A paper describes a structure:
O-phosphoseryl-tRNASec:selenocysteinyl-tRNASec synthase (SepSecS; SEPSECS) is an ubiquitously expressed enzyme that catalyzes the terminal reaction of selenocysteine synthesis. SepSecS converts the phosphoseryl (Sep) group into the selenocysteinyl (Sec) moiety in a mechanism that requires selenocysteine tRNA (tRNASec) and a pyridoxal-5-phosphate (PLP) cofactor. Recently, two research groups reported that four distinct mutations in human SEPSECS caused congenital cerebellar atrophy termed pontocerebellar hypoplasia type 2D (PCH2D).
To establish whether mutations T325S and Y334C alter the structure of SepSecS, we solved crystal structures of holo T325S and the T325S-tRNASec and Y334C-tRNASec complexes. The binary complex crystals belonged to the trigonal space group and contained two SepSecS dimers and one tRNASec molecule in the asymmetric unit, whereas those of the holo T325S were of the orthorhombic space group with half of the SepSecS tetramer in the asymmetric unit. On the other hand, Thr325 is located in helix α12 and ~15Å away from the active site. Inspection of the initial Fo-Fc electron density difference maps confirmed that Thr325 was substituted with Ser in the T325S variant and that Tyr334 was replaced with Cys in Y334C. Based on these observations, we conclude that pathogenic mutations Thr325Ser and Tyr334Cys do not alter the three-dimensional structure of the SepSecS tetramer. The WT enzyme has a Tm value of 70.6 ± 1.0 °C. While the tetrameric T325S70 and Y334C70 have Tm values that are lower by ~5 °C with T325S70 having a Tm value of 65.0 ± 0.8 °C and Y334C70 having Tm of 64.6 °C ± 0.0 °C. In contrast, because only a small fraction of the T325S variant co-purifies with GroEL, it is likely the least damaging of the pathogenic variants. In contrast to the A239T variant, T325S contains a significant proportion of tetramers, and its fraction that co-elutes with GroEL is capable of adopting a tetrameric structure over time.
Author numbering:
A (entry chain B), B (entry chain B), C (entry chain A), D (entry chain A): 19 to 462
The structure:
């Protein structure tokens, strides 16, 4: 009796997801969730009882291990041409995809950009996703050859411009105290020296390693609005930061932001290889969508859908709150640990995720020591702790960087990065701090 | 006693996979396979006991459902810039990826291209994968604007040229009996009318729907070799066909093939969204690899690795043999079924996968009937049976096709497609034939 | 859409199960099966979304891996008063239990005992289930002290009588050709000698190792009926035999059979640990059930339900046909191998499952050759093959057997056992034959 | 590389388990756990790559879903002669069984009975396991006919004596304040009256529903020792109580305790159906084990092994601490709620798990108000909450109880039960309190 009435309780919660398309506040139980997924998957034609297929793409699976791990979703997302089209052979995977995007939109508002208009998950890394942005803009701006780009030493966002077949105009950053920041004069100087006509867009970055900080999106938004140049923001892991997101929201408010791009794995704790393209003008975001040729994996969407339904927005809020606390906590431990070493926490207030500590007391010249500290942390099972020494030469797609990983040619000292990224735990910091200590003692 | 000695038996079979990198002849038991995968996954730093992470990309997972369905592989494939580089934080996923590619190479030889030099799985559809080919060629051929392309009515392979920012030079096909084939005169005519300098490459297609057939790769290979123009073959679902593959092998032999591109889902019965880029010149295939910006999903590779280890090459040989038999069987049933309807099997011998049956006895003009047959098969749970009526106008990225889906502007009659793609079963044909019959009777 | 009409299809198969309680003719698809189970599990109170529990047995599960591997079925079957009883806290578990027993009833009819009245799965193996039968009979026959038992050398069925707290009266078998068959005169003599009121039951055995054969149930059914003594049949792995089953059907037809018991795993290829108790007196089978104190595991019931739902009655029949055929094959092959060694196949026509080959030409007196042969096969990973030398002495629970494993005190010769049990494949026979020959050559 | 040194880490934890047989202090990671299990399962002969089987019990599994959900453990535990015995065909199952019993021994020490000598998991629930105890005692005391049993109203433990084939001698409890406690004088009187040789055992009970409290085991242990009678303790859910456990430890210290039995699920949050039999005479516990006829399910053993390996001893202690605390909380909260309704918390200090609240102010004589209250809570999805009106009459196995569910013939008042059992959360208490108040307001 209370049996089929128990079902209704899960049902109410699924109806709510579909009819409003926002995250649940509290996460779903696994039971509700898997129920939901089986429901969807049986909607796909490959999962019809007594189907017959005489096509070349019938979603036949050879290995039951493969079918089951994908919850029997096989046909991917989109149609032949358009990636945002309801697949006629896959009603269930189409709806998976629709819901997923909707949930992600919901979170992006929740995270600080309450005026975001439209977004979609794309099964590529952030780099290739940025590239798809550029490939779309080419068709809108025939004359353009150049992408203006405030320097940031990440091989993927840089390569994305070159993979799209454009030329990066590398605007160095300005040292303001400890921070490396947008050189607004140099940016406007280039627009004029090259002409709005010849600029594909300005390519800015929020989330980054200190001592760089998030670009001055407000001012760039204004510049772009004025010269009628597209603005594309690399927000790889900025969704988890209130500062980064408000900055984007304020940019949209006073000027022009055409699209911002975020990594799924970095913001949602899922496997690498997916991303979100998002914007404020609905039709442009659709256009980037339609520029994608063919059907794409449904795997990244499924993960994010699974992850958000289990968390609910309250669970994501909790991860965000804890990242903020873990950031303060990591900073204070590094203030304490540095002072003890006559090093200091570099003063980088405009960067809310990443931190840097001086390594001035290390004789890199005589006995490579900054570098020896590098491999030492890796072996001692510390990861994500980046060491940046002086005088790093790296070549990438032909362009040579001087001072690579410091986002500038001559930063005053070598330092060490650490970050409070989402899902970090207090044990992470304490182990890091203890192991760091141990490592320092063995070098100086 | 025979306990730890039982382990050695699985071990021998894993050692064999690694030391030689070819498929097992007979498939592995699931036990060996999952053992193998757990082994690999524990090699990834995110799965180290007592790891600490202070980075922004630590492969943290929020949902255990997500971790487990990916066998705990989280970090994806490649490094920041280069997709073929051993990820230092993911030794296990790097090796997964290496082995996967190696296995796929092994199969491509087994399938008919015994001189293939190098290949790699890429987590994008075939369309975007073709696009990555073009984006790579741009940098090698600065002057090029045009891609010469023997017509084939598939929105994705066509869009791939435009997404890469080039212009498709659409070479119509020549009607030779029932077959639509490469117009070699028109192709060479364009090379000269435009100049080798201005051609990015020739973009040919093997696997396709009848009455088109695989392009004359031999002759095009010669043309491309002569005018020093790159040759890029769309082999979307050709791996499963001995004719298609030998054709590619013969092309490489007498001339120039730079890369050929295949869908994972269509050739290996896995979820959509992945592909294989392959070639004969090692360094070029590496170059396309390095053109990809950022880390990519490891999901498609895992599926193909899982699928091939379970099948072994003998299992794949068996699927291939059965596709050939199911093709004969499907043809004979359609000869019988057509003759009974005063229709006929179109004579399309050079096409080994797809078949077509005349629908001349259908009054599309008066009562849409060809089209009514279309939705009717869909509702009756038949899929992959394509109906192509006369006078189909479709626009795609600006270009309008006249006679769309017939690969020509004025094909002599409407017809119906059916194909023997891999993993098809005799029940598929018989259900198709029965349901087709039922559908015809209700229209004529 | 096509999507929602899809669920309809699976609901149809499920509805049909619930209504008629019969096995599907054709196996269910995994998707339908897992859908079905998820519906059931959400019906247990521990899986309710709003539930709060303040009891001692609330179905709380600590480990997700444990929860998930049992499809979230936690409460077991029954109530502490009866296992046949519906659990108020677990309507889904309760439903699973009823469905299972119903399907199993179906298959017992299918397999040859078309007049079975009642049965139930009990999560104890065949031995303890026989004990549960004797324990029930105790309260029905206060004076009874003895169980009359035609000898079969298997420790579980023998211990069952002692565990139940009764005294086995071992009745020797009578050599007839090569066969060991029931000594009917000796059985009726013991009845007469001890007096019927002192006999708890007669305990017969159908399935058994050659040269023994299924007891003459018809004659025993007659004796039992005439002397008004309970007849309990050990049918551990007789469900897979039309012969054994027909013999039980015949016994019920001509005389008296109170219960027969079968192993879940031996007859249905599920893990060890469950059984089925069946009978013709519905009231009496209910009494054996109600004699069980407390709740019981639902795991074995779940295993068989999954198995029968995936195989369908057609799948199970196929296994039974394949078993018959492998029996002829294994037999012919052993006829052939024995000749080459001047041994022969013992003629045991009345045993449909198990075969015996003479080992008369190995000198166990002079050199363990028989014994060696056993361990030799064991090391070549042949399992099930049983070697029986002359004059084995085994004491079980204080009772000594001469010629243990031969079911008789003095059997003509040493022999080797081999059987065709459900799921055996030709490879099994060929590998066994090849390895036995290699082993025979070694010892000689 | 770092990868191969990784496996080393998990092997270390595994080695430590095998060597010492103790619970890990900190829980295992799933990856280590699943690695471990896979190693074990490949050690069973049914999982051998080269195996051929020609037997009746070869571990063949028809369904992959069944195979996989049991981690490919198929053969069960033991041999048909003894369950403590190593299976030659299943070294991994055999190993799993030994490890499980060892961990469980560890936890029983941990939980308070530090002098336990021996135990084993048996895949029967607590009732049948008590039966297995009486069945063993039969052969040890041929004259014994009676089981002396201080009354506790729970049908499983009562039926266990009857199922075993003995006659319960029900000893009424003595009202002491609000509590029902053992009537020691009446117990010793029955011994004297019936004679020790006619008593199979005395059967006491620790865990139980308030107002009953754990039997005075110390006094009973003394009596039992003096009169040389076996003492069997029903400890169904007492492992989670330091009090109940200390009381068993004390009884063993001062007098005689032959075995005590506990439920797997009630004490370890695994599914229903398993139990643990433990004692201080190692030889005697071995006899209870060897009295089991045949192979048994390994599922319950697997559940607890997974559970204890994931929790670790630290995890289990945390659950026990949380249970104590929720008891105070639930108690204070019930003290508060009762006052508002002019009811009181019955004073039952000696019962550490279960609480009782008076329902003296509801007129069950006039209007089912007590009974209504029960069904009312049931519909608001409160489970475990038990309502006990005055003068309930229940006949179990032909024995009639007055005031059934109250453990006495005439208890002062109707009351409501609530318990803090392992895994209870504050939400449980708050939801129960809120809903009980809403239900109390309704009835009045
Ligand atoms: C499948 C296929 C493609 C690739 O399509 P995607 O959806 O991008 O994988 C291209 N051309 C043809 C003819 C195809 O069949
Ligand atoms: C992660 C990240 C990217 C994107 O890298 P992918 O590997 O392509 O996802 C780009 N720029 C920065 C600063 C990043 O942190
Ligand atoms: C749980 C319980 C039992 C055992 O019940 P089963 O259903 O057989 O596991 C026995 N006595 C008491 C007091 C119990 O609470
Ligand atoms: C299998 C078998 C049994 C039952 O053995 P269990 O291990 O208790 O399941 C009983 N008698 C015979 C002849 C058997 O083969």
């Amino acid at each position: 009796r209370q049996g089929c009435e128990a079902r209704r309780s899960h049902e109410h919660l699924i109806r709510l997801l579909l009819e409003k398309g926002k995250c649940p506040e509290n996460g779903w139980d696994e039971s509700t969730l898997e129920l939901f997924l089986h429901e969807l998957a049986i909607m796909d034609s490959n999962n019809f009882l007594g189907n017959c297929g005489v096509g070349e793409r019938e979603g036949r699976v050879a290995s039951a291990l493969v079918a089951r791990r994908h919850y029997r979703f096989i046909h991917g997302i989109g149609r032949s041409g358009d990636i945002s089209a309801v697949q006629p052979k896959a009603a269930g995977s189409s709806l998976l995809n629709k819901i997923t995007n909707s949930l992600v939109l919901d979170i992006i508002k929740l995270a600080g950009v309450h005026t975001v208009a439209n977004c979609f998950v794309v099964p590529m890394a952030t780099g290739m996703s940025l590239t798809l942005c550029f490939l779309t803009l080419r068709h809108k701006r025939p004359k353009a050859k150049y992408i203006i780009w405030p320097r940031i030493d990440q091989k993927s966002c840089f390569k994305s411009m070159i993979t799209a077949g454009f030329e990066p105009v590398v605007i160095e950053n300005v040292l303001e105290g400890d921070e490396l920041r947008t050189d607004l004069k140099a940016v406007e100087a280039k627009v004029q020296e090259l002409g709005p006509d010849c600029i594909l867009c300005i390519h800015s970055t929020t989330s980054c390693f200190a001592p760089r900080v998030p670009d001055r999106l407000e001012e760039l938004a204004v510049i772009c609005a004025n010269y009628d140049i597209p603005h594309i923001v690399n927000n790889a892991y900025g969704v988890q930061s209130s500062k980064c997101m408000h900055l984007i929201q304020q940019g949209a408010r006073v000027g022009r932001i055409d699209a911002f791009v975020q990594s799924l794995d970095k913001n949602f704790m899922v496997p690498v290889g997916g991303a979100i393209i998002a914007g404020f003008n609905d039709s442009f975001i659709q256009e980037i969508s339609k520029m994608y040729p063919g059907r794409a994996s449904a795997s990244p969407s499924l993960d994010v859908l699974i992850s958000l339904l289990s968390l609910g927005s309250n669970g994501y809020k909790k991860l965000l709150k804890e990242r903020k606390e873990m950031f303060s906590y990591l900073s204070n431990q590094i203030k304490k640990l540095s002072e003890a070493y006559n090093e200091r926490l570099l003063h980088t207030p405009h960067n809310p995720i990443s931190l840097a500590m001086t390594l001035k007391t290390l004789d890199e010249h005589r006995d490579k020591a900054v570098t020896q500290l590098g491999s030492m942390l890796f072996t001692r099972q510390v990861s994500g702790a980046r060491v940046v020494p002086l005088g790093s030469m790296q070549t990438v797609s032909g362009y040579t960087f001087r001072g690579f990983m410091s986002h500038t040619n001559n930063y005053p000292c070598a330092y060490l990065n650490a970050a409070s990224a989402i899902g970090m735990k207090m044990q992470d910091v304490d182990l890091f701090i203890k192991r760091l200590d141990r490592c320092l003692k063995a070098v100086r």
